[PDB]
Design an enzyme around this catalytic site. Structure first.
Site, PDB file in Angstrom:
ATOM      1  N   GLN A 202      39.466  21.757  49.397  1.00 23.21           N
ATOM      2  CA  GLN A 202      39.288  20.309  49.402  1.00 23.21           C
ATOM      3  C   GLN A 202      38.233  19.878  48.393  1.00 23.21           C
ATOM      4  O   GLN A 202      38.394  18.860  47.710  1.00 23.21           O
ATOM      5  CB  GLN A 202      38.932  19.828  50.805  1.00 23.21           C
ATOM      6  CG  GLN A 202      40.117  19.820  51.754  1.00 23.21           C
ATOM      7  CD  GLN A 202      39.990  18.787  52.851  1.00 23.21           C
ATOM      8  OE1 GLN A 202      39.869  17.592  52.583  1.00 23.21           O
ATOM      9  NE2 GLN A 202      40.034  19.241  54.097  1.00 23.21           N
TER      10      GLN A 202
ATOM     11  N   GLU B  61      19.210  31.130  31.903  1.00 24.51           N
ATOM     12  CA  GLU B  61      17.930  30.430  31.935  1.00 24.51           C
ATOM     13  C   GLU B  61      17.658  29.840  33.311  1.00 24.51           C
ATOM     14  O   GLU B  61      16.520  29.861  33.792  1.00 24.51           O
ATOM     15  CB  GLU B  61      17.902  29.338  30.868  1.00 24.51           C
ATOM     16  CG  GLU B  61      17.635  29.856  29.470  1.00 24.51           C
ATOM     17  CD  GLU B  61      17.464  28.744  28.457  1.00 24.51           C
ATOM     18  OE1 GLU B  61      18.466  28.069  28.144  1.00 24.51           O
ATOM     19  OE2 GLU B  61      16.331  28.549  27.969  1.00 24.51           O
TER      20      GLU B  61
ATOM     21  N   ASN C 111      32.720  14.995  49.053  1.00 23.90           N
ATOM     22  CA  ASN C 111      33.105  15.998  48.066  1.00 23.90           C
ATOM     23  C   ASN C 111      32.993  15.474  46.641  1.00 23.90           C
ATOM     24  O   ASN C 111      32.660  16.240  45.730  1.00 23.90           O
ATOM     25  CB  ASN C 111      34.524  16.491  48.341  1.00 23.90           C
ATOM     26  CG  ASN C 111      34.643  17.188  49.677  1.00 23.90           C
ATOM     27  OD1 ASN C 111      33.649  17.393  50.372  1.00 23.90           O
ATOM     28  ND2 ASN C 111      35.864  17.558  50.045  1.00 23.90           N
TER      29      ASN C 111
ATOM     30  N   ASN D  41      26.496  18.850  55.647  1.00 26.57           N
ATOM     31  CA  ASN D  41      27.250  17.612  55.792  1.00 26.57           C
ATOM     32  C   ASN D  41      26.374  16.476  56.302  1.00 26.57           C
ATOM     33  O   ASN D  41      26.519  15.328  55.868  1.00 26.57           O
ATOM     34  CB  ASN D  41      28.437  17.835  56.724  1.00 26.57           C
ATOM     35  CG  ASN D  41      29.623  18.444  56.012  1.00 26.57           C
ATOM     36  OD1 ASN D  41      29.641  18.542  54.785  1.00 26.57           O
ATOM     37  ND2 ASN D  41      30.624  18.864  56.777  1.00 26.57           N
TER      38      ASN D  41
ATOM     39  N   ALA E  42      37.417  24.035  53.099  1.00 22.35           N
ATOM     40  CA  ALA E  42      36.361  23.325  52.386  1.00 22.35           C
ATOM     41  C   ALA E  42      36.409  23.628  50.894  1.00 22.35           C
ATOM     42  O   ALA E  42      36.248  22.730  50.061  1.00 22.35           O
ATOM     43  CB  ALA E  42      34.997  23.690  52.970  1.00 22.35           C
TER      44      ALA E  42
ATOM     45  N   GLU F 222      30.226  28.671  65.458  1.00 19.51           N
ATOM     46  CA  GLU F 222      29.614  28.429  64.152  1.00 19.51           C
ATOM     47  C   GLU F 222      28.351  29.246  63.897  1.00 19.51           C
ATOM     48  O   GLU F 222      28.223  29.802  62.794  1.00 19.51           O
ATOM     49  CB  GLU F 222      29.346  26.924  64.009  1.00 19.51           C
ATOM     50  CG  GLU F 222      28.828  26.483  62.650  1.00 19.51           C
ATOM     51  CD  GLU F 222      28.893  24.975  62.472  1.00 19.51           C
ATOM     52  OE1 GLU F 222      29.005  24.258  63.487  1.00 19.51           O
ATOM     53  OE2 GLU F 222      28.835  24.506  61.316  1.00 19.51           O
TER      54      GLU F 222
HETATM   55  N1  LIG Z   1      31.601  19.147  52.881  1.00 21.20           N
HETATM   56  C1  LIG Z   1      32.796  19.433  53.389  1.00 21.20           C
HETATM   57  N2  LIG Z   1      32.905  20.341  54.422  1.00 21.20           N
HETATM   58  C2  LIG Z   1      34.119  20.637  54.945  1.00 21.20           C
HETATM   59  C3  LIG Z   1      35.259  20.026  54.443  1.00 21.20           C
HETATM   60  N3  LIG Z   1      36.319  20.493  55.133  1.00 21.20           N
HETATM   61  C4  LIG Z   1      35.881  21.380  56.053  1.00 21.20           C
HETATM   62  N4  LIG Z   1      34.519  21.478  55.955  1.00 21.20           N
HETATM   63  C5  LIG Z   1      33.649  22.342  56.774  1.00 21.20           C
HETATM   64  O1  LIG Z   1      34.310  23.556  57.073  1.00 21.20           O
HETATM   65  C6  LIG Z   1      33.989  24.009  58.372  1.00 21.20           C
HETATM   66  C7  LIG Z   1      35.256  24.490  59.073  1.00 21.20           C
HETATM   67  O2  LIG Z   1      35.820  25.629  58.454  1.00 21.20           O
HETATM   68  P1  LIG Z   1      37.005  25.500  57.371  1.00 21.20           P
HETATM   69  O3  LIG Z   1      36.833  24.266  56.524  1.00 21.20           O
HETATM   70  O4  LIG Z   1      38.352  25.479  58.049  1.00 21.20           O
HETATM   71  O5  LIG Z   1      36.866  26.803  56.439  1.00 21.20           O
HETATM   72  P2  LIG Z   1      37.797  28.109  56.592  1.00 21.20           P
HETATM   73  O6  LIG Z   1      37.172  29.308  55.922  1.00 21.20           O
HETATM   74  O7  LIG Z   1      39.135  27.813  55.963  1.00 21.20           O
HETATM   75  O8  LIG Z   1      38.009  28.370  58.165  1.00 21.20           O
HETATM   76  P3  LIG Z   1      39.467  28.748  58.728  1.00 21.20           P
HETATM   77  O9  LIG Z   1      40.273  27.480  58.876  1.00 21.20           O
HETATM   78  O10 LIG Z   1      39.337  29.425  60.069  1.00 21.20           O
HETATM   79  O11 LIG Z   1      40.151  29.684  57.763  1.00 21.20           O
HETATM   80  C8  LIG Z   1      33.360  22.832  59.099  1.00 21.20           C
HETATM   81  O12 LIG Z   1      32.022  23.127  59.416  1.00 21.20           O
HETATM   82  C9  LIG Z   1      33.382  21.683  58.116  1.00 21.20           C
HETATM   83  O13 LIG Z   1      32.146  21.009  58.116  1.00 21.20           O
HETATM   84  C10 LIG Z   1      35.159  19.113  53.406  1.00 21.20           C
HETATM   85  O14 LIG Z   1      36.167  18.570  52.958  1.00 21.20           O
HETATM   86  N5  LIG Z   1      33.921  18.819  52.881  1.00 21.20           N
END
Ligand SMILES: Nc1nc2c(ncn2[C@@H]2O[C@H](COP(=O)(O)OP(=O)(O)OP(=O)(O)O)[C@@H](O)[C@H]2O)c(=O)[nH]1
Ligand SMILES: Nc1nc2c(ncn2[C@@H]2O[C@H](COP(=O)(O)OP(=O)(O)OP(=O)(O)O)[C@@H](O)[C@H]2O)c(=O)[nH]1
Ligand SMILES: Nc1nc2c(ncn2[C@@H]2O[C@H](COP(=O)(O)OP(=O)(O)O)[C@@H](O)[C@H]2O)c(=O)[nH]1
Ligand SMILES: Nc1nc2c(ncn2[C@@H]2O[C@H](COP(=O)(O)OP(=O)(O)O)[C@@H](O)[C@H]2O)c(=O)[nH]1
Ligand SMILES: [Mg+2]
Ligand SMILES: [Mg+2]
Lengths: 55, 430, 427, 430, 427
Positions: free
Chosen positions: B15, B245, B219, B197, B12, B174
């Site tokens: 991205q 501030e 995003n 999300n 996340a 989660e």
């Molecule tokens: N808003 C948003 N949320 C994202 C995006 N990509 C992944 N997520 C959120 O990320 C969560 C999943 O975990 P990861 O994105 O893989 O984060 P991580 O720390 O890399 O987890 P690992 O893959 O195990 O290393 C989900 O709940 C998604 O909702 C994104 O592009 N935008």
């Protein structure tokens, strides 16, 4: 580090001073036109988006 | 001059980040190669000749997401050291991302962030991105924050994280990761913004007109908020607001720091042509429950101090007229000990639109961050889901095997319980 | 030869002060490059009050600009008349303001305090005589409110005799730009009462009200608001700079209007303010100015005089006009509104006449009055401060700087006593 | 004028020397044949007409390595008396290269160096290159030093030796040879610098982006330091440091003379497009454990006086700012006595590169040689390896058979023990 | 006819003197080839003070150059004014400096000293009169700190009457360029106290601070620092070379400034200095020079006068100006700041005026003061010496040259006695 900085820096700040005076002046013009202030819109470039979504 | 550092943790974080840096390079006028066809200093450094480089560090424990940047159009912009990729991810396991695999890479990362801070003469804060449900987002984020707290001390560590949605969920474990990370963030983070999300998903369908969005559409929305918040440091304005501030005015106490997000106008191009969107209109749109970036209605709770950021040809008079009208609205509550309740800022530089973008090129916009007791609704939901799984010990063996001691599961539960008690007592009045 | 040193603090002070020099430079006739290109010999009579001359026919103002962050400074030099100031009087820090009174007073104030005082010392000891200083700052913020009070003590310690005239902007009742204003205003009041000789109070809301009621400005900006304030500052010192039929400088004003050391807070107003459509109907006579000055709507502070009683009043007139007509109006307004004046002071209205008017206007007037209506403005901030302090609040931000909680209690106690003092003298 | 003599012994010493003389001859503008298509005299003698000859002596007890130079391009550069070769190598045996075989050629070698010292009017030091594990590097290195002490007395003798690595090793009897040579260096050498292959290997992958280095890449790295060290005698500069000034500043005592080395910046061509490399960054990169040329951690101990040598467009002003910034690092430990702690050198000639080289051409560069107590860590490793072998008398018969008396083995252990005691005594609290 | 002999020893002294001759030659109008091409007859009045004339109109300075290694001699030879000096006056060794006080004083100094003294002798005996000597050296090095003291003792032996004025640079308080300076400075202090009549201390750090704060020079090379120091040498002896309304030579200064035999260390300064482009904002007058001279920031030594008290002070003025204006300014600064001057010496400020100012300035000034603030600097070096000496540390390198450990204790004993003597006279 090594430079004549102050002789260069003075030109840099002078350009910045002139830069702000321009955007101050042109902002003042478009502000005093109270249609553009309260209500106006960029109706031409906004339309270009719509045809893109059609495409 | 004055500097901000961005760190992007997890899928996340990466991205979101590449969308954000697209917004900034297009905003300032920098080609993807770093050349040119001002406020560059706040986010970039000048390498020599005519080439710029962002102040960002990308961290993940698996290479797929980072290597997309390495082969993407923006590969030339970033310094190869800035892109850090591990060998195998944490598999949505907090213990694996904190103890076993996280400590394999922590000291490599801390050197590179520290080395970048040497180039920042006037450093004033960091920006850190997470997804709470992910193993690396929660596990490695806690280890990164704890070390960073003692390394630099009194420097503003601002976070921008993604809450698990109330019903939309992609990971079964989660709830486990979110609560454990809650303890680490509460004491170390100076202020952390919340978004989820599901609220974003509903917003990009109704306000923006898209039948079926992707993570790209959500995003790009987040990048607008960060752009508006940091615009006070970059461009001229009639009322400047620095990071400090923001920190003083929003949070009444050390423990109550969590704000919520809002932005207006979010409108499609054809409907933007349909209406005219004055200052009073956009301020009214901020306070509706539909526009909130976290799916919690403020009407269950009350408002503490709120902060307003205005971009465009907005004049200090029209702001004062609008905010006073909002005070008259009896659908909005304020706790008694915040009669002032507001902090306003005005900046002259309009937002920037993107090729293939979703939002209209409006000429006046507003961004909002408010502190409300309605966020306790989100805390209660996460607590209930965790209790059902932990009562029968549904997934403990995975975390214990990866170095985690079981005693940390009840401790993180109690710390969240203490946090919920603080909001209730704050919500009371005398 | 009654030189005055000018100090600007914070965002509010620098923008008000910068507009202030545009007014004076055009009045005396100084080209923005600093050279005299005027039209009358009387302008160069007493320009020494505010300026120093650089060899070459170039005049430099006695200005010192103070801030904690350099953002506002470069906005001043970007202005048209920014080149005028001496580059070395620009004294600024490299830290955020913080919008915090304690942070400005203790942490960043001490570091900048020593450097500022010597900059003051250069201008204060470069002139043949020194009457007093002139401070421009707001009270709701952290920079002008916090560091301004600290500098006010040092100025009093070094230079007790000189007049420490200060102009203040008070946080507004209805809509205001800062959450923690009750903390900032309450703490600052303690330093103003004991240190400064003269305090003038301006409220931003009244400035808006005058613009929409009288001037009929469809879109007022901070330039128009700051233009009104600069006129009053120009009017008070006009007796120093130009000849007149009856002179009245600063020290006359303090003696007459201030009956006791602590009662020296003032309200101001400016006449004539003419609507752009009413100009063809308004015949400019001396009684016409008298109506505008004593009218309650014209007051620049959002405290209604009718709710209180006057202690002293002062009016300044600019232009060639009849001495009989001016003196008769003071008698007329005093005798026709006797219920708003204190019995144990006869002749509560002071008057003055100065010969040279502002450009474009063939007659103008300035009003300075002292009244018990100030009990309204201080009761306002006291009520908000109490509720914000009964429970603790943002206070932890101030405690982490060095400020003790006992200072808030002392701050309220002194502020409360000044409210009771005005209550007593109403009887 | 002022002169320095370079001696190359064994395989390791002469192979480095081939790279060194390439770097010098290219820097001064002399073709490999010794002709031209100043500082020239500091390293070369002018035979007449227009031909130049180096001040170097190449010795190894086996002819393979020297015959490469005799047949290579530089065959036309040297004087054939300088190229001295034995018959059979030392077989990685100390006793063979010191007592039995080493004595065939020692008196021939000492004549050539002394004959070379006559033409040199203003000599001020020697430059000797060793490898401790080898029989010729250690056995013949010890024998050469013992004579030069009595032959010349008060002339500074500076050495460059490759200390055995922690894990990387190519000889099984390597720990035996190092301790025997340890006694000889400590008494006779004026100051001896430590380097090791394992840290060089890791250095030439991370900083210089090389997948798989060889012995050739490492030898160019060492040559840059020597060229940087001696540049103060050759080129102009704002601050000049002679050999004797080096000698007084670095050593507080007699037996504490061993320094460790560092260099900056060592960067590839395509990374230099992103980085500024101003004086702050190059000084900050010096103190990282990653850049040290000996795989020993400085944070495990404390620092005595350090010396910094600068090459490029460096003004005396911000070098003081760089040193002031370093003194603020709480991760850097200094001893309470010697609170000054620094000597700085500024010389204006930028670094020199080589065709087909590995190092990017940079505005300015900094070389660091420092004295620290962390080198006792290197001695403790070697001591532990020795005790395991000598407990069961693993290889003593080979050394005894070649004339060596057994009594030396505990004595050499005794001397190394005293040296370890001295460093911890000085490193102790004031 | 008051000739002065100039000696340059060490790297720091040589380069300062090289710039110092550029200042004089321009001021007199001597072509770099040694020939006169000037513009005024007054320049040829008393050129005999610093220069010798070679038959043919070629003027040669009285300069002697000394070093232990030939590096700096070749650097001066390639300089713009290198051909000016007399080639036989270049005396140097063929060994490294060593940065060792004992090595320079004992090992190499003795062989060079016998030749150097004879090089002094040709010039000192060649002139009609000889008032004093002029030496430039550092007090942290190995050549200047050691060999300069050795020659100073010998010169005192041969020429007891003459004024042995030296110009020294002190190791900096914050950042310095040598590990073992505290040993070097402490050993040299013993010699200078007893042998030299006049010692002026200058700090490199204050030179940098002057460069940013006033001169704004972003990168000050060693050319600027040496030029600033060169101004002070030119100012002091200017009274000998040009006429004026009130003459004040070196011996006039010694008797006035020095109350007791051992308190003769001085801090120096110069005015005016030009802020780039900001000189158009400044009206230079005699009162303005007074402001800079007694401004503590313009002091060239990093010892704060305000933390101590003054004993004697002296100011020179150059140019056609009023004598009443000068005498009123000295009285003004002494009366306004009584706290920093001693009661048992009235009229603590001496004054003087010279007719001809330097080229490029229509007036200029020089300030020399003697104050108790030197106790700050000597405490600095004593502290570093103490904690270095207790551990012994680098003494190993001085002992092997023939210096007994007893000399370190004696050197500290005299240094500490000097500090106490300043402490006692503060009462
Ligand atoms: N808003 C948003 N949320 C994202 C995006 N990509 C992944 N997520 C959120 O990320 C969560 C999943 O975990 P990861 O994105 O893989 O984060 P991580 O720390 O890399 O987890 P690992 O893959 O195990 O290393 C989900 O709940 C998604 O909702 C994104 O592009 N935008
Ligand atoms: N840096 C570097 N080290 C080398 C090179 N060649 C050999 N070595 C080192 O030399 C060490 C052992 O010394 P030897 O190879 O035995 O050299 P020697 O002194 O001649 O010993 P003998 O050949 O037995 O006479 C090994 O550990 C290698 O790391 C080289 O080209 N560069
Ligand atoms: N009248 C007036 N008020 C201003 C101006 N600029 C800012 N203000 C108000 O002054 C108040 C305090 O300003 P602040 O930035 O805190 O000043 P500082 O803290 O002393 O530097 C704010 O509420 C502003 O809205 C101006 O030009 N005129
Ligand atoms: N002002 C000035 N100082 C210098 C110059 N060159 C060197 N120094 C300083 O002089 C100090 C000691 O000089 P040093 O080389 O030891 O002189 P030495 O005694 O002849 O060897 C050093 O700390 C330098 O910082 C220069 O050109 N000007
Ligand atoms: Mg991941
Ligand atoms: Mg061999």
């Amino acid at each position: 580090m090594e430079l004549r900085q102050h002789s260069q820096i003075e030109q840099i700040e002078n350009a910045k001073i002139e830069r702000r005076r321009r955007e101050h002046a042109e902002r003042l013009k478009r502000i005093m036109d109270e249609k553009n202030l309260q209500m106006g819109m960029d109706y031409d470039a906004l339309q270009k988006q719509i045809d893109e979504k059609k495409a | 001059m004055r500097e901000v550092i961005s760190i992007h943790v997890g899928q996340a974080g990466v991205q979101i980040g590449n969308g954000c840096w697209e917004l900034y390079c297009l905003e300032h006028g920098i080609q993807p190669d770093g050349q040119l066809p001002d406020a560059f200093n706040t986010f970039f450094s000048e390498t020599g000749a005519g080439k710029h480089v962002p102040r960002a560090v990308f961290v993940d424990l698996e290479p797929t997401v980072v290597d997309e940047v390495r082969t993407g159009t923006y590969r030339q912009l970033f310094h190869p050291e800035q892109l850090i990729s591990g060998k195998e991810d944490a598999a949505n396991n907090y213990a694996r991302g904190h103890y076993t695999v996280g400590k394999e890479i922590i000291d490599l990362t801390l050197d590179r962030i520290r080395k970048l801070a040497d180039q920042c003469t006037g450093l004033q804060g960091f920006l850190i991105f997470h997804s709470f449900g992910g193993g690396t987002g929660a596990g490695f984020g806690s280890l990164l924050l704890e070390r960073l707290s003692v390394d630099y001390g009194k420097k503003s560590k601002l976070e921008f994280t993604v809450y698990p949605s109330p019903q939309v969920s992609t990971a079964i474990v989660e709830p486990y990761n979110s609560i454990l990370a809650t303890h680490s963030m509460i004491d170390h983070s100076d202020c952390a913004f919340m978004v989820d999300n599901e609220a974003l998903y509903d917003l990009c369908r109704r306000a923006l007109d898209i039948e079926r969005p992707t993570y790209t559409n959500l995003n790009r929305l987040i990048g607008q908020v960060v752009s508006s918040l940091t615009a006070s440091l970059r461009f001229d304005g009639a009322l400047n607001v620095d990071f400090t501030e923001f920190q003083t005015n929003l949070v009444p106490y050390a423990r109550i720091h969590f704000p919520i997000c809002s932005y207006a106008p979010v409108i499609s191009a054809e409907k933007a042509y349909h209406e005219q969107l004055s200052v009073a209109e956009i301020t009214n749109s901020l306070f509706e429950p539909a526009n909130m970036m976290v799916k919690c209605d403020p009407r269950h709770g009350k408002y503490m101090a709120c902060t307003l950021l205005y971009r465009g040809d907005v004049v200090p008079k029209d702001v004062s007229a609008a905010v006073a009208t909002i005070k008259t609205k009896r659908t909005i509550q304020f706790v008694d000990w915040c009669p002032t309740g507001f902090k306003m800022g005005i900046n002259y530089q309009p937002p920037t639109v993107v090729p293939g973008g979703d939002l209209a090129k409006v000429q006046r916009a507003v961004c909002m961050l408010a502190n409300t007791t309605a966020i306790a609704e989100a805390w209660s939901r996460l607590d209930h889901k965790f209790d059902l799984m932990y009562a029968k010990r549904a997934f403990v063996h995975w975390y214990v095997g990866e170095g985690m001691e079981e005693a940390e599961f009840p401790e993180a539960r109690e710390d969240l319980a203490l946090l919920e008690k603080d909001y209730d007592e704050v919500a009371a009045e005398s | 030869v009654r030189e005055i040193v000018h100090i600007q603090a914070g965002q509010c002070g620098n923008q008000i002060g910068a507009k202030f020099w545009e007014v004076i430079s055009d009045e005396h006739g100084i080209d923005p490059t600093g050279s005299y290109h005027g039209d009358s010999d009387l302008q160069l009579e007493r320009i020494n009050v505010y300026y120093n001359e650089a060899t070459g026919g170039k005049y430099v103002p006695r200005a010192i600009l103070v801030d904690l962050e350099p953002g506002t400074m470069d906005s001043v030099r970007a202005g048209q008349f920014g080149q005028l100031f001496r580059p070395d009087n620009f004294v600024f820090g490299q830290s955020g303001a913080g919008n915090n009174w304690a942070k400005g007073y203790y942490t960043e104030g001490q570091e900048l305090c020593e450097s500022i005082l010597d900059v003051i010392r250069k201008e204060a000891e470069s002139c043949d005589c020194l009457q007093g200083f002139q401070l421009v700052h707001s009270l709701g913020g952290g920079t002008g409110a916090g560091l301004g009070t600290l500098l006010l003590n040092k100025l009093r310690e070094e230079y007790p005799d000189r007049i420490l005239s200060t102009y203040s902007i008070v946080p507004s009742p209805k809509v205001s730009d800062t959450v923690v204003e009750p903390y900032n205003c309450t703490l600052s009041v303690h330093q103003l009462v004991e240190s400064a000789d003269e305090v003038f109070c301006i409220d931003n809301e009244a400035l808006y009200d005058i613009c929409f009621r009288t001037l009929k400005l469809t879109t007022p900006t901070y330039g128009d608001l700051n233009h009104l304030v600069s006129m009053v500052m120009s009017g008070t010192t006009c007796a120093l700079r130009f000849p007149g039929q009856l002179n009245s400088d600063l020290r006359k004003l303090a003696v007459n209007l201030v009956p006791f050391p602590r009662l020296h807070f003032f309200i101001v107003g400016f006449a004539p303010l003419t609507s752009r459509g009413s100009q063809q109907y308004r015949a400019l006579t001396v009684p016409e100015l008298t109506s505008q000055l004593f009218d309650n709507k014209n007051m620049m502070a959002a405290c209604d005089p009718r709710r209180g009683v006057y202690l002293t009043a002062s009016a300044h007139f600019r232009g060639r006009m009849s001495s009989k007509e001016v003196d008769e109006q003071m008698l007329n307004i005093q005798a026709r509104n006797t219920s708003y004046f204190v019995e144990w002071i006869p002749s509560n209205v002071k008057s003055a006449i100065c010969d040279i008017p502002p450009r474009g206007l063939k007659m103008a007037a300035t009003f300075i009055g002292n009244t018990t209506a100030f009990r309204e403005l201080f009761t306002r901030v006291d009520s908000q401060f109490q509720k914000m302090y009964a429970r603790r609040a943002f206070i932890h931000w101030y405690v982490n700087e060095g400020l003790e909680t006992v200072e808030f209690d002392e701050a309220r106690s002194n502020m409360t006593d000044l409210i009771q003092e005005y209550e007593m003298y109403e009887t």
